Subunit: 253 residues, 6 copies
Amino acid sequence: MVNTVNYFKQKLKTEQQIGMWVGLADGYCAEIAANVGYDWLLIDGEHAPNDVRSILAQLQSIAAYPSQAVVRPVSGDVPLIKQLLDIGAQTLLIPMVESAEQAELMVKATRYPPEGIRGVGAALARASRWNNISDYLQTADEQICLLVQVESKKGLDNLDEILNVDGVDGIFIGPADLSAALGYRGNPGHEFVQNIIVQTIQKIRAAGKAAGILSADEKLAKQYLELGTEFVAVGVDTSLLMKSMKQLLSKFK
Amino acid sequence: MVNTVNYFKQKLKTEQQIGMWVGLADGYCAEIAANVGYDWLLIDGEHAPNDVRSILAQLQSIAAYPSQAVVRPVSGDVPLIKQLLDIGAQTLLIPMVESAEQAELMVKATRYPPEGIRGVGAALARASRWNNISDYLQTADEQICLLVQVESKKGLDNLDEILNVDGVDGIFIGPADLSAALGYRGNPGHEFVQNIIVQTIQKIRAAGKAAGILSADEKLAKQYLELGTEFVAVGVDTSLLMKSMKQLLSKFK
Amino acid sequence: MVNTVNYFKQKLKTEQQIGMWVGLADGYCAEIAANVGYDWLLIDGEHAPNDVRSILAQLQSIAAYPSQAVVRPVSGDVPLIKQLLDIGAQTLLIPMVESAEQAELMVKATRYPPEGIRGVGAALARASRWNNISDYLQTADEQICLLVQVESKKGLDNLDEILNVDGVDGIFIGPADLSAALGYRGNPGHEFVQNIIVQTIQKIRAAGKAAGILSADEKLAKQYLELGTEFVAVGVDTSLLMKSMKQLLSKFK
Amino acid sequence: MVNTVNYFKQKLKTEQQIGMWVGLADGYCAEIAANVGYDWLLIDGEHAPNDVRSILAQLQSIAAYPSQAVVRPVSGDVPLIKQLLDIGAQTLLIPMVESAEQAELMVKATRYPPEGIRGVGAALARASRWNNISDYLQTADEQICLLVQVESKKGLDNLDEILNVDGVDGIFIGPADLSAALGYRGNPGHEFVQNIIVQTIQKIRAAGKAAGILSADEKLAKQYLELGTEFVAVGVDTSLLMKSMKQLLSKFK
Amino acid sequence: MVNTVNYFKQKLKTEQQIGMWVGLADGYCAEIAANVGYDWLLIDGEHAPNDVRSILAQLQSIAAYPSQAVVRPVSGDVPLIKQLLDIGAQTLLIPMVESAEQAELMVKATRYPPEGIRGVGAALARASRWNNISDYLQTADEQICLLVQVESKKGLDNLDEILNVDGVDGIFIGPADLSAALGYRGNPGHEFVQNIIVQTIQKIRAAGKAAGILSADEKLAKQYLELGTEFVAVGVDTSLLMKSMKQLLSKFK
Amino acid sequence: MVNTVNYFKQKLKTEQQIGMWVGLADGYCAEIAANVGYDWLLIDGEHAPNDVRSILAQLQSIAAYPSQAVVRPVSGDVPLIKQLLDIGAQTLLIPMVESAEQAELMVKATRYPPEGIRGVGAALARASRWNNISDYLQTADEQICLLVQVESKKGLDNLDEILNVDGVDGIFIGPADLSAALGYRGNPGHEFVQNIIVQTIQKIRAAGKAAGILSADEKLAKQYLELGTEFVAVGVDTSLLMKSMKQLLSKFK
Ligand SMILES: [Ca+2]
Ligand SMILES: [Ca+2]
Ligand SMILES: [Mn+2]
Ligand SMILES: [Mn+2]
Ligand SMILES: [Mn+2]
Ligand SMILES: [Mn+2]
Ligand SMILES: [Mn+2]
Ligand SMILES: [Mn+2]
């Protein structure tokens, strides 16, 4: 077998990719999302009740569909990154990255020695299909994509430095965490926050990296798309389930 | 402790109850549905990948919320009915009921001996809260509600007979199974099917029984509500999740 | 490997065996019960939320301990008996057995063709340790023990006939189901019920079969032991957990 | 979306299909088997500790791979067939089929009314991808394949009759169950059994149905392939795991 | 919806709260404990085999009952605290807290930016009921209760400093860990340990914080209640299950 | 009850122990491996999708069999070590140990205070069988075995120092991680790597420590056995399953 091509990584330089957040945290719900036709599905290990085993089930569900899986670990934990890479997650979104030093540690966490610190366990990994992918150890990083989140003041204070780290493919802006860090908690739509988000997107793209963002606000998502943002998540499965069931009941109360 | 009051059973004679189908088959998804404020939630053991243990998890999720749980078993199987009652399901919807004899068997399956054939295991049952409900074995049937589905030609051929069975609290009409049985598979909206559904609803109510139905068609649901149908499900969680995610993506393609 | 010896079966002719009911329905709880030193543990597939997979987990937990596992299926269902035997349950307690014809069907359900109807799948079975027990198919029945419950009026009406069925090792009396069937629901301690239980025990032992019973009442359990009852369950894990936590709280209110 | 094409059904008339038995009963183990390149994978609900939910996980695992999934239910239970079809199993292998009447009931169990008795629940089914497959209810049976097992004397006594049932695509011969039924339990390699198996294969193919079989014996599997047997399983995952680990240890003991 | 009121937090200034340790690590066992009437239930993520998903199941079980849930994470890990808060744990017991600096980090781990470092993910959180609690982000901390354990020499060496940390609601004393740290392992009832525990309790209450402790020794528990200890756990589910099953067996040997 | 004897620990000074890697990550697969007769089974928490609860299931499976369980945690994390010891893992293999200071931290993580930092929670631990092992807290470390992996340049740079750490029972060499760290990724068979492995093995044994290694290469495994290596794993369950299924299919293509 040849390595599974990371089409999300390829498309970062060729098109704008529309994303759905998957926080329903099981293989059945991930498969329903996978039938819709999103460019990418974010399996949320940070803010949904997911562990390595529940993320594996969702990777296996989504694997039969064109939608590209991206996994967000709970933190930039190097052993957890090893685990998530070995179950076959090819794109990672690391939350709360705040310095070039931490971003460089995330790069190394995704690469085998001698260049990186990714633990070697190919015989056991769904990532190598248990060595059915014959040259996995020589070619794996070619299809690994590393994204980091800038979503704190220290993040923004280290933005130019993080954007000069080779092997960071994209910087994702977290409006919920960022708005809260800026004293506008629950109010990311404020001009003060949006002006910072827009400038941040322009700087990411000027340094030749992919810019990303999540907004459930259609108008803000279309505006981020008009600015050339490469990977835009436009909704969240839990939010769509709750809102659709509330809207339906309001037709009858 | 007193037995948990079956508010769904009480409201069959006092108000019209708005229902949501739950086929996402896990405790987390059931809890999201339970926060909306539906009168009832149908935990689907027939058409969603549920077993006794997954239904138990969803009962435990929903228990903290005012929405009343109704469980559909895969079939009118007497041992499975025993299992679902013991995990604390107070309202059961039996599919494909086709005779008074079968309807009477379902009544007996929900009542302790000597009058019924429900196996006795109160010490072990969430239904009795493991005997923390002190008189459970004397009072249990007071809060048990039995609904049967008429959704075949044989069911319609035995409708008057089923409607004379004491202990059947309600007859639910299944438009998908019924339209298929009538040679109008996937087309329940056809006048030939609707005329049968309307007459069936009038007969159920004329015999002093609660009538019920599921339609995701708002207009048909409101019409069934205008006819006095006591328990109307107006949507399905799997359908709402898929449709909401599809509608959102189409704003961006 | 040699077949796992069924010490419960052997001891039916040599000693009185003290049992604990296991309805906590998981591997961890089954293991706690296995450390106590009961002669047998009843894994309850009838009145606790168990399925074949949860029962397997509990067999695996208990396997490291001298306590002998007995599995009660939800009903005398021949395909479920097949499943429970193949996961390696060597002793089965069949509920609600009401005729010699049904008891003979249960015997056949436990034996390979050509003399029985047990489906053959030793390559796949924990029962054969995946053919690591080399002659499993020739010797399996030597370590299979079939118990049937008499716990209805029809049961009692067919008692002498069930007791002439070769391959029924033991008849277990269910006081909860029997007292209910006799119109003394939740009142098994009534003289009318107890007189029937005592005569039933004497008739079981006079026909050379093992007699069994469950009572959480110490005095009734000791009386059944004085009558020579071969397998006596003296308590239930769910009841002991609830009762000990209630008793502890009352010291503090 | 268009229905998932049942390539196993198509290939029954065009090539010989090599099968692996999957009894490791989880999604991870099913995915490892799915990487090998077998024409088909038998997910065993009869002789491995599987339920509807564990079979769904294995369907989701295997779905990303060319290997075609076949599900064996524990028995010809019509409600269980409904469940397995709705989770998206397109090929079923029914054990212990013993008459044209039972084979015809299995055909109907796989077809919607008015022609069959398959319960209609497309909105909820992975089979319809939750109605993402737009005309599922009109086209579903085109990609459903029904196989039945002849593996008893009554099976063989009704063979000509079962082979005249329209909608039975294939008859699978079970040498373990058949050898046991013929008084040669654990000894299917006996000439008396093999002569019956060969004649049975010739009769299946002469009536224009697909013949199938499992043998872990390479020589017998190649002989069944030389006779034109359309679907041949050549090994079992549990057997290969145990045998490979035993063979490895014997190099060191 | 309004935020779920934290009655445990409110009662720290108004009454003494009787607790039960929950280490049986599943939703069903948690529900049995929830029926008893304890003021609080400690879901033990440190010393029982729990993960975020098993803890969620137990929160969901307990949610239907007046008993207040308290969750002990395995360690004062900021990302795990984030996870446990988002699944809706309103009271946290942090083990092995040893400095004011660590206690202040725990406070910040429970509060949103800009004043704390709790990651923002309300759309996905059971804590916000998926934004069904409309102002969750503004009001969440009002119903969050932070308890820290002092159970090491370094803890005791930093006690006055931890007790001046604003946002620490309570200090829980761990006699098992403390007695071990003092060289009296498994002997917490020693006068040298008890004298330290009594002085620690008096100092906690003199600084206006709630004092807590676990003892399965009734006499020590009542003594701690006489000293005015605000939250006293009086037993452990695993210990009560094992002890009640042992005591029952000894009546029969 | 007496503590479970750690036969793996005893045999480190008396015989050479043959090991099988278990990365199929479930209780059923672990039981199949446990029936083979390996001296030890490595439950891989680092490179297979395991968590504390799945490792517990595999400990319970293996407990009934003579094969000794060794658990590899994902990293030398002190709270995770506490968790794995409490579920009853008596032998731990710590990956990527790179200094005497880290090796000494691992020793302390496995011992109760006051000499170590293992959290005390015996009442809740399968390790103590919930205090059914009466003196557990006094005797536990006697049956605890700590192994550390040297599999980096820093590890080799600190080898003599790690080998002088009292309480390190064995040093395991990881050829995959070591070959990668030496710039020979996927090529451990290279003379430059093998010469380092052989010298490392001689130093470990000269310092009176047990040496260990994994090789799926029979010739290399036998050579390590000829050098006196005390614990040699000779294969991996995932590799044996995939290879055996591939080899079987190639006989038929
Ligand atoms: Ca199940
Ligand atoms: Ca888990
Ligand atoms: Mn964020
Ligand atoms: Mn229907
Ligand atoms: Mn009974
Ligand atoms: Mn067969
Ligand atoms: Mn402690
Ligand atoms: Mn390694």
